[PDB]
Amino acid sequence: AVSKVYARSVYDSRGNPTVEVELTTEKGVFRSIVPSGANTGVHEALEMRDGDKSKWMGKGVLHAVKNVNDVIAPAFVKANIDVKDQKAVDDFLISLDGTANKSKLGANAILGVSLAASRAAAAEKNVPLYKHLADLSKSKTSPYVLPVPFLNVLNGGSHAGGALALQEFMIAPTGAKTFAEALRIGSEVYHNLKSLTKKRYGASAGNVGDEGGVAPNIQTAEEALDLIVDAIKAAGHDGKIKIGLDCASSEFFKDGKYDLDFKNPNSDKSKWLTGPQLADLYHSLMKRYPIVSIEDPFAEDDWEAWSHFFKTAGIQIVADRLTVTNPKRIATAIEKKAADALLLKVNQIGTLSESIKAAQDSFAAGWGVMVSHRSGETEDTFIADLVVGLRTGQIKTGAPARSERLAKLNQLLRIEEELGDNAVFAGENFHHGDKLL
């Protein structure tokens, strides 16, 4: 059935190379592209880079591509694998590599084959990809569930000037009745925000960060949040749009404490916050703003700070760098009551099967799952089908700007259209989209 496996270098949305895999069967040629994060969690599966400073700023993926072409491909073609059996596909890939963190072959060599295999399988079954992914995950299909998009609108933190410590501010049109409506009203908030931002901060603050949000020089979280509320009001959608945060607090964690002025080299060490103090800051925000989700409020191994905040949070708390889409870390997060939602990034773990397992483990513990892009994305639309397949009710895949983001959101429009009356929009029920009836 699988007659050829092939990899090439292509460019991601930041202009860095990444791995593209093609798998050939009797049904044709199936393409998958591997995304790439920035400042990746210490516990992420290995993204293999060449480190040749004379090529691509040291960011080549020739070694990973060669691992697909020269290592995986001939073994895989000769293994006679049934692509419909994703578990077998991934058991085979994992066994070749033989390392816990996929450092022998690279997670970016393994994932492309893993994903392409599922695309070939959907074609063999003559079903759209989301239907096949629902099969793999054993999700309920009457109805299917369309996700609330968590749309990045404003960018802070590492990639941003100003003193704004928190990294992502998202809007979530939970009040919409359909995905199409959600994306329309979201886009309208975005345009109002871009307009407000250019008027208040100058023409250049209207330019966008890696995920398509505006990135003005903002001083505080309150300034950013007041700006967003203004955009929601101006677009006329007050009451229909909620807010999500990704704090990316690992970026400002220094020896036990949290430096909210970490962009300032002469930061006052005596002003760095403890776990409980930072949690106080979040509660202050949650009281003044319609915040329904907070991601990585504390650092990637700061278990105690997570568990403490979770007792009284009362809103969705999303694990990203804490859990790294890794069932082993998710088990720890569940036991410790650290969070109540998984940010699912297939390339943090390296296979579709492990990713599906991570989602299933989360759902089983009463957690939600927010399927996620990476900050370096591509024209690949896999995660749009994956979020529907997993029935999660929520995705973050960027601002409604830059087509590595729109490709996913557009694919959701297509899936919504196709599904017709056998789909429902998760809306206010996004957190438990998987249990929505």
If one asks whether residue 159 binds a second copy (CB under 8 A), the answer comes out as yes
Using CB under 8 A as the binding rule, whether residue 9 contacts a second copy is answered as yes
Three-state SS at 169: strand
**Shortest CB 47 distance to a second copy, Å:** 18
Cβ-based burial of 130 (10 A; exposed 0-12, middle 13-18, buried ≥19): buried
Residue 25: strand pairing partners: 28
For position 12 contacting a second copy by CB under 8 A, the verdict is yes
Question: Can you tell me which of 160, 241, 278, 388 binds a second copy, judged by CB under 8 A?
Answer: 160
Give the residue, chosen from 170, 215, 318, 344, that forms a contact with a second copy under the rule CB under 8 A: 215
From 101-109, 142-150, 187-195, 245-253, span contacting a second copy (CB under 8 A): 187-195
Dihedral sign (CA 274, 276, 277, 283): positive
By the rule CB under 8 A, 187 interacts with a second copy = yes
What Cα–Cα distance (Å) separates residue 14 from each residue in 20, 44, 374?
16, 20, 11
Nearest by Cα to 187 from 398, 400, 396: 400
> By the 8 A CB rule, do 307 and 247 touch?
no
- Asked if residue 83 lies in contact with residue 1, where contact means CB atoms within 8 angstroms, the answer is yes
Helical (H) or strand (E) element with 131 = helix 129-137
Nearer to a second copy, 211 or 354 (CB): 211
Q: Is 230 annotated as a binding residue?
A: no
Residues designated catalytic: 211, 345
Q: Quick one: tokens of 285?
A: 């925000």
Q: Report, in Å, the least distance between residue 134 CB and a second copy.
A: 21
Helix (H) or strand (E) run with residue 17 in it: strand 17-25
Contact map string, positions 98 to 137, toward a second copy, x by CB under 8 A:
----------------------------------------
Among 117, 146, 183, 339, the residue binding a second copy under the rule CB under 8 A is 183
| Distance (Å, whole) CA 248 – CA 327 | 21
Residue type, 146: L
Residue 14 as a binder of a second copy (CB under 8 A): the answer is yes
* Alpha carbons 59 and 247: distance in angstroms, whole number: 27
Task: Find the shortest distance in angstroms from Cβ 82 to a second copy.
Answer: 25
- The binder of 406, among Mg ion, a second copy, none, by C-beta within 5 to 8 A per type, is a second copy
- DSSP E strands: which ranges in 183-249? 242-246
Secondary structure letter of residue 375 according to DSSP: S
Q: Is 374 annotated as a binding residue?
A: yes
Binding site for Mg ion (CB under 5 A): 135, 246, 320
Specify the residue, 42 or 203, whose C-beta has the smaller distance to a second copy: 203
Cα–Cα distance measured from residue 390 to residue 395, given in angstroms and rounded to the nearest whole number: 11
210 annotated among ligand-binding-site residues: no
Interacting residues toward a second copy by CB under 8 A:
8-16, 20, 54-57, 159-162, 183-184, 187-188, 190-191, 202-209, 212, 215-217, 236, 377-379, 399-404, 406-407, 409-410, 413-414, 417
Return binding residues: 159, 168, 246, 295, 320, 372-375, 396
Known binding residues for substrate are 159, 168, 295, 320, 372-375, 396
